[PDB]
Symmetry: C3
Subunit: 282 residues, 3 copies
């Protein structure tokens, strides 16, 4: 008989998970390059784009990437996002690169087996399940809406890959309380990377409104916010946003986040139609 | 190929696991519970609902209910709640004939929202009523924290193995067979009544509790009990489970032939 | 349907995992693994250290007094023997089984009774006799504690992957190495390692003072193309070969082309290996 094994996922995925080194020039008195911080990263495609954690590369004078096949590259920082703790790196590779398996049509499910891959002790693999799937939208809601897993997530595998039993990327491990780890869902991680590549930063739309649906009841209105300037008031009920029926608070704030700053959109509330000018997130 | 997944167990079991809010009016304590049946009975931990002025239950489908306290048991750290069942309730899958085995895959289901973790059964534990302590509870390496305490332990079919209860790596759960028995006794009597013979240690008697049933019947230390209540005593642990099932006030012979009357287990 | 279960592995393996009692009162507790019908048992050195009397308890209730055959500091392994004429449960062992990263494993150990936890192989480790440190043991996310230390790490067939030895990363001696160590402890009462005194054709980085290499005339920066009539491709593999060579043996070492006769010696006794230094 065949022993039960996730080795298939490992062989398919693991070569695309790299070591990431943060080196400073002010770290020691002799101003020689020295490692400040270590972490993991995931090679996304053959152009040399790599996703890692922002906290791994913060204030780096030099970023080094090391592949499992022995190759070492200096990396350039494309951009970073504090809200997701993600950063994107670019290495210049000759001769091809290993790349993480991805299936964009795969729907992650609570209970899916996952392996956490991270690269002192060498490349480590730990196993768990998806505890919670989290949200793929741009509106930051906090950590509760990231992907949760009971696969051990430590400083060793942070910025590394979370894959399913087929070796397909589920998310990017991010260190952040009791026996539970977090990852950025891959669908969101991909969106963040494309935005960082294009704009050098993640641009979010911000309407400055709190609320919860029973339409959507407004609990609070941010001061000097787009909603306040438009004339929106507390206790008001928003039945539509940008010609999109609003059945949900979380769903609506995700829609706003996609809307580019400077865009004017109708906000229907009960019936007064207000013209709101979307602004960049804080 | 499809990804390896326990999502089947999740889909079946998870809707039956609820949040429990202890209010003393603000929320003092939080926990999880398991809807047992369509009558609206819910099992949770005693330590969750202790000193509650009001108890509230929230289902994954968003419905919120005020809950009645039916009763609780310190020894198993279980409590039973009851809520309005009118509209119909999601219930935990249960198989009374299912025999749990060491090595069985289990999911612990129960702040950050509903949380599901995976592990195996390390030890099956005893389903009897005589309190033995936590060592005889079901043990699992599926992470057990405050978040899931009072929540469900289920197998890959979604069937209920146990009720989660609080080294560092091992979690404990009341075996579902014992939880079922506790719940029924709480529904009937409003508390768990246990038969108590007051004997430690055929079966060699190590000690005899003072002013206990055994002492009053004439049983002396170092005596050998070959039978209790027309049953052979092969095992101490199994004999005490039998005693626990016996109603207080009942007179049974103890062959060592002495007549003893059962006393209700000490409340503390 | 049927519930997903590793119980098969449990029924095959767990009976062979025993409680080990170090008494001097009981100074220390631990777990052990019955390896074969002869009654040899593997456990941890740190469990049986300074033991006046060692006792072994099987899950079936039988209890035995154990003889200490020997121990090895580098692998934290020790071997016990018990005399049992009533037959013994043995751990399943498959010597042709190749452990892979990602294999499911159960950690079995024998307070709170026998405990079983589940995880995977994070890293396979090395089976060589030359000590490399903890980095090269087998790594697993199956919880490894005082409870199961010295106990068995098995795959889903109940076959032995390794022997548990003490964050969320557990270590075990790979079974292939554990078997080699046990056989050496049984024969010699201690692990005797061949030592050439060289740092890692193969470019020599350093030559230990008063060492076998130094006495043979080998110099630093030299290239070793052969050792004991075997090609030297790799440093790690070559030091494993030397480790198997009995002390006192005289082997040729070809270097570029001078042939040198080296007298292998015992590995200088080092309790300092795992110390940082
Ligand atoms: Ni030292």
């Amino acid at each position: 008989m065949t022993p039960a094994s996730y080795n298939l996922a490992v062989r398919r995925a693991a070569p695309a998970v790299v070591n990431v080194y943060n080196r400073g020039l002010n770290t020691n008195s002799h101003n020689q390059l020295e490692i400040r911080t270590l972490g993991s990263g995931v090679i996304m495609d053959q152009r040399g784009y790599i996703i890692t954690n922002k906290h791994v590369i913060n204030d780096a004078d030099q970023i080094i990437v090391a592949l499992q096949d022995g190759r070492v590259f200096e990396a350039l920082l494309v951009g970073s996002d504090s809200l997701t703790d993600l950063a994107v790196l670019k290495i210049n590779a000759t001769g091809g690169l290993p790349t993480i398996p991805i299936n964009a049509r795969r729907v992650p499910h609570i209970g899916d087996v996952v392996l956490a891959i991270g690269n002192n002790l060498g490349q480590t693999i730990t196993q768990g399940i998806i505890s919670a799937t989290g949200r793929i939208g741009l509106n930051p809601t906090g950590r509760q809406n990231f992907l949760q897993t009971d696969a051990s997530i430590n400083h060793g595998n942070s910025g590394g890959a979370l894959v399913n039993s087929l070796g397909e990327l589920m998310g990017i491990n991010t260190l952040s309380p009791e026996g539970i780890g977090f990852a950025i869902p891959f669908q969101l991680a991909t969106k963040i990377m494309d935005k960082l590549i294009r704009d050098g930063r993640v641009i979010r739309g911000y309407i400055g409104i709190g609320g919860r649906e029973i339409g959507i009841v407004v609990n609070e209105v941010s001061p000097d916010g787009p909603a306040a300037n438009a004339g929106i008031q507390v206790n008001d009920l928003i039945i539509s946003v940008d010609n999109k029926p609003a059945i949900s608070a979380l769903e609506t704030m995700d829609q706003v986040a996609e809307i580019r700053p400077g865009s004017v959109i109708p906000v229907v509330v009960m019936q007064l139609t207000l013209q709101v000018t979307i602004q960049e997130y804080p």
